[PDB]
Amino acid sequence: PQITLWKRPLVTIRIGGQLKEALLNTGADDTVLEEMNLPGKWKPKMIGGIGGFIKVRQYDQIPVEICGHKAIGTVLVGPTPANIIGRNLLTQIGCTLNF
Amino acid sequence: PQITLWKRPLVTIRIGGQLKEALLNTGADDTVLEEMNLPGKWKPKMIGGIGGFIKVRQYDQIPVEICGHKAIGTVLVGPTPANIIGRNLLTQIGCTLNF
Ligand SMILES: CC(C)c1nc(CN(C)C(=O)N[C@H](C(=O)N[C@@H](Cc2ccccc2)C[C@H](O)[C@H](Cc2ccccc2)NC(=O)OCc2cncs2)C(C)C)cs1
DSSP: OEEESSSOOEEEEEETTEEEEEEEOTTOSSEEEOSOOOOSOOEEEEEEOSSOEEEEEEEEEEEEEETTBOOEEEEEESSOSSOEEOHHHHHHTTOEEEO | OEEOSSSOOEEEEEETTEEEEEEEOTTOSSOEEESOOOSSOOEEEEEEETTEEEEEEEEEEEEEEESSOEEEEEEEEEOOSSOEEOHHHHTTTTOEEEO
16 A cells, blocks of 8 residues: 555554554654563563653564565564554565655 | 665755754654754644653744755754654655555
8 A cells, every 4th residue: 555644654463363553653663562462582672762761572573464464573562552663564565755 | 756664764854044864754743853943933842652752842834845845834842862754744745655
């Protein structure tokens, strides 16, 4: 698809076999998801948002399906009020900024 | 311009009379720039995200130059760890996501 920015670019993502609504975010390297248990090893991380930093768990090689598109990559799980799909996965699904 | 997402989508913006780098951010409802002086009035405001919210000055109908593209809109000024160009202005310059 080709999403416009008049409204927040929200889409459906599937991960761990669970379906979630996410926001496409060119403004961030990594992808952050709302708390949700996931399998695998994981290292602790600290990431800074607009109002400060939050602690997250970084999982690697996690398959995440975005709007029908396949992606496998590093996912950060933690206190975020919104599942934000970052650049790495964006490029994985062939997303670009056009103007 | 076709922007890949493999790297930060930074672009030069000319505002007021200053030319600085800002991120084309589709994960932001608003445009936020780092502390600076701007002419005009302004109502205080609190914008938030990961880590919480921050205090910013809201200026409206502010001229902004983003890659030979002229836009006139709302510009929040304050303690942002990054110069952000949000959807309010991205749409103005006719920008979309495609994949
Ligand atoms: C509540 C929820 C349903 C929503 N609210 C909104 C509206 N809001 C609040 C925003 O758009 N808020 C913006 C914002 O921070 N957007 C964010 C997405 C988000 C939205 C809501 C809650 C948490 C994260 C997305 C933005 O690209 C910012 C920009 C940025 C860059 C460097 C330093 C700080 C910030 N990115 C991050 O906060 O990235 C965190 C990281 C990810 N991986 C590593 S750090 C502000 C800049 C204005 C959209 S969805």
